[PDB]
Amino acid sequence: QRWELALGRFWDYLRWVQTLSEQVQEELLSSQVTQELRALMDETMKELKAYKSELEEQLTPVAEETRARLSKELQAAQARLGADMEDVRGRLVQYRGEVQAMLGQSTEELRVRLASHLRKLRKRLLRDADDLQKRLAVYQA
């Protein structure tokens, strides 16, 4: 699906950030990484909303209380995905400020801590994307 490809571009970019390689460390102290993640996040959420909209053209007619519930559960699952991606961006903004506060001292321990936290944020994003995909797959029925 288009929204899955969009999410995958966010995911591959974030897998690169996770390496904290020389060029990642450089781009994390500018706005570049968080600006590129914002663009990738925005595209994912736009495609998700359009996908849900087109799915609603080929629905199995069910009880109206049921449809209303499934739609609200799907909107909550979309919301969690967007919040997850924003939580990632926010953690990388935090890193930028903590490096500046070090006034040129070594950042090795900040980077060890960031790597560990990013791994956990990425696991949560993956969890939520799988749950969203599963909900979308039975939504029409």
Ligand X SMILES: CC(C)(O)c1ccc(-c2cc(Cl)cc(C3(C(=N)N)CCC3)c2)cc1
Annotated binding-site residues for heparin read 121-124
20: left (phi over 0), alpha (psi -120 to 50) or beta: left
CB of 46 closer than 8 Å to CB of 78:
no
Is 55 a binder of ligand X (CB under 6 A)?
A: no
Site string for ligand X, 91-110 (x = CB under 6 A): --------------------
Task: Give the residue nearest to ligand X (CB).
Answer: 8
User: Shortest gap between Cβ of 3 and ligand X (angstroms)?
Assistant: 8
For tokens 């995905």, the residue is 81
Q: Binding residue for ligand X (CB under 6 A) from 5, 29, 83, 115? A: 5
Is 88 a binder of ligand X (CB under 6 A)?
A: no
DSSP three-state, residue 22: helix
Is 86 a binder of ligand X (CB under 6 A)?
A: no
Closest to 45 measured CA to CA, from 13, 14, 84, 12:
84
List of residues 6+ apart from 30 with CB closer than 8 A = none
Question: How far, in Å, CA of 105 to CA of 124, rounded?
Answer: 32
Q: Binding residue for ligand X (CB under 6 A) from 86, 98, 109, 130? A: 130
Among 7-15, 48-56, 102-110, 111-119, the segment contacting ligand X (CB under 6 A): 7-15
Q: Which residue's CB is nearer to ligand X, number 12 or number 98?
A: 12
Is 56 a binder of ligand X (CB under 6 A)?
A: no
